[PDB]
Subunit: 252 residues, 4 copies
């Protein structure tokens, strides 16, 4: 019972193979009471989140919608109880149009597309924190998903730029969260005619990781998120935890 009696909001569940689905699954197994967030296909999300070990209320949240954000805190409290507060927040939201990641050349991505990607992947981490910090308990934890953007790589393109922005956003969210006695951290996960480029990237990851890396298994990264949601990392804030097999510490 690592997360026993903790109220945790989990965003980004779209499929049963989503890291957010495994974070929610592992958190419930560890005794956490969950609140879930869905963006567009809510009835589809409801049917995915029915396969979770325990029942949890599903709330609508389009992170680009100002009204959804301004009402989020009220809707969460109605779902957990008038006098109850959140102990954790999981930001597992990421988006970049295909012009900004994949086959499309880096220079050919229009700003409107990259901006939408930065809005959803980086700015929204601050939006969700602004909306939920007033309904969070001291000793609380905000966890976001990152993909190590310290070095450029093919096909990830503008999504790497959005993750660099996200890391910087996290350092500032930590400053704001600190006032509430809440921690804010990121988990940098390993990977979970541009098909050849991503194959090269995935093969290289397992090769570099001293303990190896299984791309078809999201549970080691879900456990890391849960470790950050627990009271077992209480002096860690504005930081990045690498759940990538230790591949970022190895050149070859």
């Amino acid at each position: 019972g690592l997360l026993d009696g903790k109220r945790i909001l989990v965003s980004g569940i779209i499929t049963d193979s989503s890291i957010a689905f495994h974070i929610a699954r592992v958190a419930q197994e560890q005794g956490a009471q969950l609140v879930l967030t869905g963006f567009d296909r809510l009835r589809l999300i409801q049917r995915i989140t029915d396969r979770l070990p325990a029942k949890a209320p599903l709330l609508e949240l389009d992170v680009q919608n100002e009204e959804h954000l301004a009402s989020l805190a009220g809707r969460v409290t109605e779902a957990i109880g008038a006098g109850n507060k959140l102990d954790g927040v999981v930001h597992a939201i990421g988006f970049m149009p295909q012009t900004g990641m994949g086959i499309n050349p880096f220079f050919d991505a229009p700003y409107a597309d990259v901006s939408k990607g930065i809005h959803i992947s980086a700015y929204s981490y601050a939006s969700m924190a602004k909306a939920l910090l007033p309904i969070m308990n001291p000793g609380g934890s905000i966890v976001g998903m990152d993909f190590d953007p310290s070095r450029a790589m093919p096909a990830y393109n503008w999504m790497t730029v959005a993750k660099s922005a996200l890391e910087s956003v996290n350092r500032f969210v930590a400053r704001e969260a600190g006032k509430y006695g809440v921690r804010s951290n990121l988990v940098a996960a390993g990977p979970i005619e541009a098909g050849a480029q991503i194959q090269l990237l995935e093969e290289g990851w397992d090769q570099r990781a001293p303990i190896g890396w299984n791309m078809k298994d999201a549970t080691p990264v879900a456990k890391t998120v849960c470790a950050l949601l627990s009271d077992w990392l209480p002096a860690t804030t504005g930081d990045i935890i690498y759940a990538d097999g230790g591949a970022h510490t190895q050149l070859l």
Copy 2:
């Protein structure tokens, strides 16, 4: 004559108190032939660029207009000569609305404002490179201006996020520029000249104190010389990198 016979495009001159003004001044002193770019007040910018040691053609460039960027290659070539190409490109444009930096709380900056800031301060480094790489010579150099965003600090707020984005953009611009035999680097400068006033005072005082060789905020010439060192042939194996012209303050805790 560090930059002797080099054709260099310099963006971001609006006043003579700018780093872009000193980069242009130092580059001309080192024998570089310049092409200059201005945003809106071209009449006032032409008056400012007259304070530069030598004459240089002025071209209008609003980095948010895809019409100006598409034209750039054609406009720069007619200013330097039909058969001549650029040897250097200086990106010295940076903007963030006051909602994104200063006194305004970090959470109170609307996305439209932060997006405009990221567009001008980060995305435009890729826009300018896309437009100018086809008219650049091998051994060429693209330089951008940065402010170390690795750690959060007061007031800088969303400009720190835009600079983090710029660093990432630079690593990708290096990949594209490499195909032309062109280098792409950023120069991370130290600070250049009631609560907000006290915070910035603390940041500037701390910089000089941390810097092993000290830091003079009223002097932009050590950072302009660093940009010129990157525009030269003296750093030929450096790309996708950040050169710190901050007195060594980023390597020191206290």
Copy 3:
């Protein structure tokens, strides 16, 4: 029961205010079976380890002593059982002569002193890992103690050089540990109390978004225990910062 049924070797307990004592205390509370290591004042150390919630065998280990190394693991297996193996290793060993840190100028530290410091503070992480990896279970964890050496600072001097070496040693220990299915990580702690030393120690509290209490070693001990658990299984050759987030903030 975060560490339930885990056999963990803990080094560096010399006092009741040491991080190593609190790691051992927290680990026992979480259901871990411990093996302890002592360097010199082993009679005094035994009287300190009696203040631990549960009984644990104390073994002699001078990290500069070649015979103590290589005899270590055989002595561990006799203490835990012939068929039992270790699940965790805590390296909480650090030393630098006063010529290498404090008031003495950086240039005035002789190599013999800095070398002794690097031997005990950095090289010994590889020595302890070499000796204990053959008696470690897959899913195992090796944890070392670090103090962020990425930037120079007053007084820390050659100890900063030894921690930079330690960080590099840990990336290589991870490569070796990986073939046993064992993780190797460092915990970079904020200042822990035991003018120039005072000024630095107060900066951390102001920079840390959640603040920093130098008189409390329990948040750093819990971080070590989180690394010893199965809750960070994809983390290796890494550094976890338990400094209140101070390293992510300029001011």
Copy 4:
């Protein structure tokens, strides 16, 4: 010239092909007056330094010898002139016994060997700075040679640990040098094909070691946006000279990467 009228101390010239030789060659071409340092094979180094474009005095310096360090400054001043001071120092000294790098397992390197390596590769950067800072002019520059140790890699082993120690030493040397108005920086070079490096590619260390280093060198050129030529030391020599010049005056305690941009690229 870039270095016109500058007095520069250059250490580590042992072969007519090494980085220290090209630094010295490029510096002399740029108008620098040099002072050279030699380890043991003095008469051999003297005829290797005769290949340099201009004549330069050669001084004996065993970096592990306390007496050689204590007399250093006096010997340099006698070679340049009683009233003249040094404008630059180039530390191009690096050593690690084969127990600490190559085929030998990481855990099998004895401390005495790794310590000798750290003494020569890292500690000596501070030793040379201590000895030469009192005879250095303000605006001066100290440059050391590095190989990016931020990530572990095959064969480099304890030399990576010595290199990590060197970067930390450099940040503290910058603090000391700052008092004299002198900068201290490291140049992190990409892989350079030295006499030993060619031999390991040929298979002097075996098939496995030969394959590992080939993988490391091939990967470097592939990662480098502008490519990487291991047989050419001149781009790294020019970077050292850029740091010795007045064109990077606000850079200290830092690392300049002359590795083709490889360290900024994952793939």
